[PDB]
Paper text:
Human Shieldin consists of four subunits, REV7 (also known as MAD2L2 or MAD2B, 211 residues), SHLD1 (205 residues), SHLD2 (835 residues), and SHLD3 (250 residues). As the first identified member of the Shieldin complex, REV7 is composed entirely of a HORMA domain, acting as an interaction module in a broad array of cellular pathways. The Shieldin complex acts as the key downstream effector of 53BP1; it not only binds and shields single-stranded DNA ends but also mediates CST- and Polα-dependent fill-ins of DNA breaks. TRIP13 forms a hexamer to drive the REV7-mediated disassembly of Shieldin in an adenosine triphosphate (ATP)-dependent manner, thereby releasing the DSB DNA ends for resection to promote HDR.
We prepared a TRIP13 catalytic mutant (E253Q) that can bind ATP/ATPγS to form a stable hexameric topology but lacks its ATP hydrolysis activity as previously reported. By contrast, monomer F is in the apo-state lacking bound ATPγS, leading to the separation of its large and small AAA+ domains, thereby creating a seam in the hexameric ring of TRIP13. We observe that the N terminus (residues 8 to 14, designated REV7NT) of C-REV7, which was not visible in the crystal structure in the absence of TRIP13, becomes ordered in our cryo-EM structure of the SHLD2.3–REV74–TRIP13 complex and is threaded through the central pore of TRIP13. In this configuration, the highly conserved TRIP13 Trp-221 and Phe-222 of pore loop 1 of monomers B to E, as well as Pro-270 of pore loop 2 of monomers B to D embrace residues 8 to 14 of REV7NT in a ratcheted manner. The structure of the SHLD2.3–REV74–TRIP13 complex reveals two direct intermolecular contact surfaces between SHLD2.3–REV74 and TRIP13 components. The primary interface (site-1) involves contacts between the safety-belt segment of C-REV7 and the conserved and negatively charged loop (110-ENLEEETENII-120; hereafter designated the poly-E loop) of TRIP13 monomer B. The second contact (site-2) forms mainly between the loop 88 to 95 of O-REV7′ and the NTD of TRIP13 monomer E.
Residue numbers in the entry:
A (entry chain J): 15 to 104, 119 to 138, 145 to 151, 198 to 207
B (entry chain I): 6 to 37, 40 to 106, 117 to 206
C (entry chain K): 15 to 33, 39 to 105, 119 to 152, 199 to 205
D (entry chain Y): 3 to 12, 33 to 91
E (entry chain X): 2 to 8, 34 to 50
F (entry chain D), G (entry chain E): 19 to 51, 54 to 77, 89 to 429
H (entry chain F): 229 to 254, 273 to 324
Write the structure that this text describes.
Amino acid sequence: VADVLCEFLEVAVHLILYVREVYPVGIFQKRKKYNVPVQMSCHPELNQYIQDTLHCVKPLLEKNDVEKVVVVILDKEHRPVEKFVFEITQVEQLLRAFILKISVCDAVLDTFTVLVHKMQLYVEERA
Amino acid sequence: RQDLNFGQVVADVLCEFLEVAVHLILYVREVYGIFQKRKKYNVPVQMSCHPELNQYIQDTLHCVKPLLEKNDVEKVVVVILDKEHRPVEKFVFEITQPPSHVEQLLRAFILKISVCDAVLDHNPPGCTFTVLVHTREAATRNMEKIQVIKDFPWILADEQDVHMHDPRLIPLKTMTSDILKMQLYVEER
Amino acid sequence: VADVLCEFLEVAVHLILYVVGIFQKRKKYNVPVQMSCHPELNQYIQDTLHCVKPLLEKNDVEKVVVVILDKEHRPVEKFVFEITQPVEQLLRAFILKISVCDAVLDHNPPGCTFTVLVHTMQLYVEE
Amino acid sequence: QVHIFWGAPITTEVILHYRPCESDPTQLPKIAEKAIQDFPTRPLSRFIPWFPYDGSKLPLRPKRSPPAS
Amino acid sequence: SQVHIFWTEVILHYRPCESDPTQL
Amino acid sequence: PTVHVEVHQRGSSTAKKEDINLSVRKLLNRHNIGDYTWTEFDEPFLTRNVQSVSIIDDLSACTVALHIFQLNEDGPSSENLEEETENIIAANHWVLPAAEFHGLWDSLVYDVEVKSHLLDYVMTTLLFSDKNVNSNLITWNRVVLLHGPPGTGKTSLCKALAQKLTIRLSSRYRYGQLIEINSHSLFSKWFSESGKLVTKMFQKIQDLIDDKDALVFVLIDQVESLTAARNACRAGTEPSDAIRVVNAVLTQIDQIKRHSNVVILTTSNITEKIDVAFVDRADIKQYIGPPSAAAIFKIYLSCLEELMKCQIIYPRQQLLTLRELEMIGFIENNVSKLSLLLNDISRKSEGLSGRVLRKLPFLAHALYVQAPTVTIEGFLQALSLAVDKQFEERKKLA
Amino acid sequence: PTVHVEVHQRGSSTAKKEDINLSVRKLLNRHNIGDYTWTEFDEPFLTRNVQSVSIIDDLSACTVALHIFQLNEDGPSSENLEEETENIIAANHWVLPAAEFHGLWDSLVYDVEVKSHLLDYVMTTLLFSDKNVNSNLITWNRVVLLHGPPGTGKTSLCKALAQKLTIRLSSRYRYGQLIEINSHSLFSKWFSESGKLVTKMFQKIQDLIDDKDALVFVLIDQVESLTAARNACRAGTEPSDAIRVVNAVLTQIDQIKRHSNVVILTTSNITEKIDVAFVDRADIKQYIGPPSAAAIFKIYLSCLEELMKCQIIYPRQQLLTLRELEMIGFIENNVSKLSLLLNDISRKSEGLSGRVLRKLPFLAHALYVQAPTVTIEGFLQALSLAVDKQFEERKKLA
Amino acid sequence: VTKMFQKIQDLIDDKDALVFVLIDQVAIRVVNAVLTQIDQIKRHSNVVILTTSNITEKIDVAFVDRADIKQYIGPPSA
Ligand SMILES: Nc1ncnc2c1ncn2[C@@H]1O[C@H](COP(=O)(O)OP(=O)(O)OP(O)(O)=S)[C@@H](O)[C@H]1O
Ligand SMILES: Nc1ncnc2c1ncn2[C@@H]1O[C@H](COP(=O)(O)OP(=O)(O)OP(O)(O)=S)[C@@H](O)[C@H]1O
C-alpha cells in the first residue's frame, strides 16, 4: 500500500509548501488527477522529484529503520525552522484528516528537505 | 525633523477583505455554478462574473463598510445555511481586533479557504449565506449604524437570524496579526 | 554465496591495506594472513561489507571498487575490482593476482586511508 | 538511520543520498547534520475561541436577500 | 548505475562519528 | 569610629550566615590588627565557605561592622515594553551583585571628596527617612547628576555605587536592584508615542518599587538623550514632541520623589547644556574631571601590580608608593630609582583621561615590546614612549 | 626569532590540512635557502593541491610557522531591515578570508610602519586575552581610527588588516566576519529614527559576535558622519541628530568592549567636526599620509614590473631599486639610466594621492602610446608627460 | 538582470565574443538584485560594461565608484 502512501506524502509535502507560501509562484491549483481530491504541484519535474525521492526511500522506508519522516521546511540558511515530523506507524479517512490535521496544525503556526530519521504529525517550530 | 500622524484603514478593509473572502467563500463554500476563476491578490481567487451581484455586495458590505467600522463587531459571521436560515457551516470570523501584513497572512487565509474544499465535506448545494454582525451591544442596538445605507435597509435582531448553534470548530485558521485577531474558524455543524 | 563473497571482500580490502608493525599474522578462512589486530577496523570493515550485503541481496551490481586513496584523498592510485558479479588455491589465487599487481606496480604511503566504493572474480588497477 | 536529501532546487549511522550532477553544493553534511539535530521545540499550542457566542450579546443583520440562481 | 561512498543516482554514506572532513 | 569588613561567599558556601559572622569575629580577635585583604585562612569552614575578607575604609578591638555578601550570576533580563511585540529592548535590569561589577569601587580612583560625599548622601537619606521628618518641610528629589570632560569614567562610578551600597545596606533591605534606562528606545516617530512610552517606563519602575524590601537605583546613562534643552530648539527644525518628552520625564521624576528606597543616578559629559528645569531637579551635581598626578600614579601602580601578578612581567620588584617616597625625602637609591622614574612619567602624563590611562599598559606592550615577557625598566620605558605617542597623535589630529 | 609562511590552497583541492603542512615543511627543509614567493613545485599532489607559497617579513633557519587559508569565493551578503526590508540598513557582509581581498596587503606601500604597529596591536590583544588579565583593571575599547588626505588609501588598509588577520590567526578562529557599515544609509531623519536605527544594526553585530568561534571586524566608513561634533557646534537648530545619534552609538560600542573577538576599524576624512567623546574611545588613531618620494618610486616600480610580468613592456630591462642606486652612488650607465629617469619622475610626481598614482600608468599608456607592445624609455616618457597632464588637468577644474 | 545576464554569460565564456553590455539610465525595491549579478559578470572578462547613466554628479555608491573612467558630454554641436 506504500506505493500510494508515498503519494499521500506527496500530498502532504506540497500542501505544506502551499500553505506556507514558501514561494510566491502560485503554480498550485486544485488537481483531482485520477480522482484524488488533493492539491499537488503542476511541475512534473517536481511530481517526479517527490516520486524518485520516495523511490530512493522505498528500499529505505519499509525496511523500518525509520524513526520519523521529518519533512523539514528549510530556511535561508537551510535551517529546520519547521520540522513537520510524521511517525512511521501505519480509505480516505486519514487522508483528509491528515489534510485536516496539516491545516489545523498550520492553524497555530504562521525550501524543503525530506529527512528520514496514528500519523501523529507534529511541528517542531522555532519559538 | 518631522514627527507625523497616521492614517489607519483598520476597521473597514476587514469587511471588504471579507468581500474578497466572501467572494472566495461564496465560491468555495459551494454556495455560488455562476462563479468564475479569476486573479486577484496574487492568489487563484474565484469570484463572480455578475456585476449585478458585485453591486449586491456593494450594498450588503460596501455600504456598511464605514458602518461596520465601529470596533464593536465581535463575530463577522458568514452563516452558511439552508432555507431555515440556520447554519451548517459557521464561518465565524471571530474578529478579536487589537486596535501589508494583513494580506501577507490573508494570503494564507484566501489560500487555505481555497484548500478548505479539501477539508470542507460535501456541503449540499442550494444554501445561502447571512452576514451576522455580532456587536458588543445585543439585540441590534442603534439601528442607524446598521441601516446607514438609504436604498439598502437593515433589520433588528429578529428571533430567526439572531442565533446559531452546533459549534464544532476545526480552526482551519488561527491567523493572529498586528491589527487583526482574525480568529477565523469554520465551525461545522 | 554473497555473504562469503563479502567476507572475501573483507580479506581483500584489509589485506590490501597491508599489501607496518601494527599488523599481525592470524588464521582467516584457513590461511595465515598478516593484517591488523584493530577491533574497531575489524568491525568497521565488517560493517562496510554488511551494508554492501543488502546491496548484493539486490543482485544488481557491477564492481566493488576498493579505492586505495593517497593521503590527499585525491586518487593518485586506486584499485577497481570489476568482478562481474551475476579448495584453497583459488581463494588464495585472487590474493596472488593482487600481490603480483602491487608487485609490478607499487603501493601508497603507509596509511592508505581507503574508502570502499561499490558500482551497482577479476580486477585491475587504475594507477 | 537518517536520510538527508539535500535538494529541491530553488549509535545511529547516516545513509545520506548524494545523487549529484552539479558537484557544487560544498555543504551537504553540516546542513545534513543541521537537518538531523532537534532544535528549540515549541510546545504544541492549543486552540480556543476568545469571543464565544454570548446569549446576552447578540448580532446585527441587514434586510435584503442575494440574487438566487 | 549506483555508486556509494563509504566515507547515476548516488547513495553516499556518512557515518556521522567520523565527521572531521569539513567539506565532505 | 567604625571599620568595615566585607566577606565574600563563594558559589557553594550555602551553609549559613551567623556562623560566618562569629567565625570572622574570632579571626579578628586572633589578629586584632592601612586597608588589608585576607584570602588564605586556616580553619576549615573559613577556608571553604569564604573567598575573601576585606577590611576597607591600628587597633581593631573597637566597633567593627560585617557585611556578608554573595555574588549572583544572573544576566540582563531585558524588559520588552512591547505593545505588539514590535518594540525593542529597554531598561536592562541588573540585580544583587552580578559578579560583573565586582571589584569596581576600588579600581576607580578619584579625589577623596567624590566617594565619601556620594555615600553619606544616601546614608543621611535613610537617617532622615526613619526618624520621620516632615515630608514637605525638608525634602529632596532623590536625583544625582555627574558631569565632566569625556572619558573620566562616570558610568563606572554609578555602577560601583550600586554595588557598594547594595553590600553596605544588606541589613535594612533584603537586597539591591538597578534599572539602566535605554534613553533611546523611549522615543518614537509617530505623534505622541514618546510621552506615553516615558510614562510607561516610569510606571513599570514604580511597579518595581512597590515592594519596600528592595533598594532601587535607576541609572540614566546620558540624560541629554532624554532631557533635551527646551528653548534652544530653534525655529521649525525641532517639533513640539521634543517638549512633551522633557516635561513628562520631569513630572514622573517628581511623582516618584515620595518613596525612600529609590535613588536616580544620571550622568552626562561636558555637554552640560541640560534643561534648566532638570538641572535644578538634582540634589548633588558632582564634577568628575581628569585624574590628577597622585591618581595617575595609583592607576599605574595598580596596573603594574596586576601585570606582575598575571606573569606578563616575570621578575617581580617591590615598587614603593608616594607615602614612603615622601617619608624618605625623595632620596635617590636603587629601590626607589624605578619608583621615581615612574613618578617622572606620571608628572609628564598629566592631562589624559582615565579612559586611556588604563590602555597604556596595553599599548606599551602592544607597539614597543616583542617578547611576551619583559623586565620593569624594560617595560616602563615603553610606557613613556606610548605616552609620548599618544600626546603627539592627539596634537597632530587638531 | 620567528618568520611567517603562507600557502595558497586551491578550492578544488581537498587534501587534509596536516598533509599540506607536512608537504610544505618538506619543501622548505629540502630547499632551506629573501622574502621571495614560491610558485614552482615538483610533486603532482602538491601541484594539484597548492597554488603558491610565500614568505612574509635567504636564510636556512627552521623557525617556521605555517598559516594555511582559503579565500572564500562569493562576495558580499547584504543586510536589510527586519520589517522594513527595502533599504533601511543595507550593510555589507564579507565572510573572510575573501577572494577580492588578496594581494591587497602586499600592494599598499607606506613609510610610517602602520602595518607592523596595527598588526602587533591585535597580537598583544590576544596575548592579554589568553593570560586572563583583569578586564576591570587593564582594558581597551577595541576601536582603531585612521584619518588623513582623501584618496590616500586610508580604507584600503582596513580590508588588508582583516584579510591578514583571518589568514594569520587560522586554527584559532575557524573564520572571520567583516561587516562594512554604510554611514549614509542610516540617516532616515524625522525625529530620531536614525538614532533608533543604529540600534538594530548593532544588535545584528551582537548576533555576529556571540558566535564565539569567529573573529569579527566592524569597518565604519566616514565615522565623521555618524558622530557629528555636538558641543562646539553652536547650532541649536539641530534637533536630535547631533545629540541622539552620536549618543546612540557611543553606547552600543561601549557595550561590545566587554567581548574580545571583535575589533572596530574606522575611516575618517575630517580631523575636526568629530565628537571629542569619540577621540578618546579609539585605541589607535593613525594618520595615513600622501605618498613620499621613496614610496612613489616603489609604487611606480610595482606598476612597471607588473606590466613587464604581463609582457606589456616586452623588452625586459632590469629596473634597479633605490637601494642599488644608493650603493652605486648615482652613476650613469647604459642600464642605470632608466632607474634614474624614474627617480626624476618621482620627484616631479610628488604630492599626488595614491589613487592617481595607481592610475597614471593607465593614462600614460592610453593617450601618449597606442602601441599594443611598448619599449621602455618611451613608456617612461609617457609617464613623465602624463604627470604634467594631471597637474594641468587639476588646474583646469580650478 | 537574472536571465538576461545568464544569456549574456552564455555569450561570455567563449573566447570569440567581444560582448559589450549597455545599461540604460542608471528582488524589487529591497535591493534590485541587479547589482550582485552585474558585479559578478564583471569578472568573466571579454564582457565590457557601458552605462548611459544620464545622471550628473549626484550618484549612489552602488555603481558610480566601481566605474573608473567618467566623461561628460554637454550640449550637442552645430
Ligand atoms: N579615575 C579613574 N580611575 C580609574 N579608571 C578610570 C578613571 N577614570 C576612568 N577610568 C577608567 O575608565 C574606564 C571606562 O570608563 P567609562 O565610564 O566608560 O567612562 P565614562 O565617563 O563612561 O565615559 P562617558 O560615558 O563617555 S562620560 C573605566 O574602566 C575606568 O577605569
Ligand atoms: N598609499 C598607497 N600606496 C599604495 N597604494 C595605494 C595607496 N593609497 C592608495 N592606494 C590604492 O588606492 C586604491 C583605493 O584606495 P582607497 O582606500 O579607496 O582610498 P581611500 O583612502 O578609501 O579614500 P577614501 O577615504 O575612501 S576617499 C587601492 O587600490 C590602493 O591600492
